[PDB]
Amino acid sequence: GHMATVKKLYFVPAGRCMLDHSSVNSALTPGKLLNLPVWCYLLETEEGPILVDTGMPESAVNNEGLFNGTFVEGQILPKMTEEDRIVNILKRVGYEPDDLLYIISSHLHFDHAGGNGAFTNTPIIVQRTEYEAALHREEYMKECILPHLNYKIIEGDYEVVPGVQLLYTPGHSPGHQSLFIETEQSGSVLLTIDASYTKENFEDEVPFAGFDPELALSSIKRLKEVVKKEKPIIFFGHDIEQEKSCRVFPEYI
Ligand SMILES: [Zn+2]
Numbered sequence: 001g002h003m004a005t006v007k008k009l010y011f012v013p014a015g016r017c018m019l020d021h022s023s024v025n026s027a028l029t030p031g032k033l034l035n036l037p038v039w040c041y042l043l044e045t046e047e048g049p050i051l052v053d054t055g056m057p058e059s060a061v062n063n064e065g066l067f068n069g070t071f072v073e074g075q076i077l078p079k080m081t082e083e084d085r086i087v088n089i090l091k092r093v094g095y096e097p098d099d100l101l102y103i104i105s106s107h108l109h110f111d112h113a114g115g116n117g118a119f120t121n122t123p124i125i126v127q128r129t130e131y132e133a134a135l136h137r138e139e140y141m142k143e144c145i146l147p148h149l150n151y152k153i154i155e156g157d158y159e160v161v162p163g164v165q166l167l168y169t170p171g172h173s174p175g176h177q178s179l180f181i182e183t184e185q186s187g188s189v190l191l192t193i194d195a196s197y198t199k200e201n202f203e204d205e206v207p208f209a210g211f212d213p214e215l216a217l218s219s220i221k222r223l224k225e226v227v228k229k230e231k232p233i234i235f236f237g238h239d240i241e242q243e244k245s246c247r248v249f250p251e252y253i
């Protein structure tokens with residue numbers, strides 16, 4: 001259209017989040033927090049720019065105690081400043097919300113959809129099973145399921161534009177989706193998002209936080225079949241070790 005690859009894939013830091021280490025390895029005894037990366041991804045494509053995930057909600061800004069008084073008190077502590085609000089991140093990079101062709105929500109956890117309300121015109125691509133879940137499960141914040149946004153509800157695998165494929169990967173959340181991207185510079189890239197927080201969750205199948213761990217494992221299996229075929233480079237969702245070698249904005253892949 002004419003391109004089969006994305007021009008640039010940017011990894012864009014969007015604040016951080018403390019979680020207990022047992023969230024990355026369900027076998028670990030709770031009591032040590034890990035300061036984990038929160039990411040959004042920007043895709044420059046022939047048809048326009050696409051943003052994958054939108055960071056944390058404004059209620060998390062300078063509010064590590066956001067989850068005090070809830071069922072996750074002391075287990076999740078967002079590390080978010082004013083600068084990490086998605087509109088401010090976008091403006092620094094060179095975009096306004098209405099510039100974006102699409103938003104892709106991997107899932108509607110607070111660390112992935114907290115910014116969604118900023119995008120009131122752009123279509124927001126989300127799995128039906130995720131949208132449905134967000135309407136009632138208690139792990140979902142109001143900020144992540146605002147009623148009148150321009151949702152583009154999808155079911156299962158989906159091609160967003162040429163070069164940008166969504167892979168249905170439920171388990172971590174009921175409608176979680178991962179990304180398989182073909183880039184001009186790097187070729188095949190698999191962004192697991194939270195279908196594996198870390199390399200060991202994926203390769204070693206170490207269990208991690210999720211709504212349905214059995215499902216999460218089947219999704220990992222499915223991803224391994226794609227990997228066997230495509231031999232992509234693979235990036236995990238909340239991996240402090242891999243983060244050490246990620247190329248990040250203004251670098252791209
Ligand atoms: Zn998540």
Ligand SMILES: [Zn+2]
Pocket residue numbers: 109111112194237238
């Ligand atoms: Zn996450």
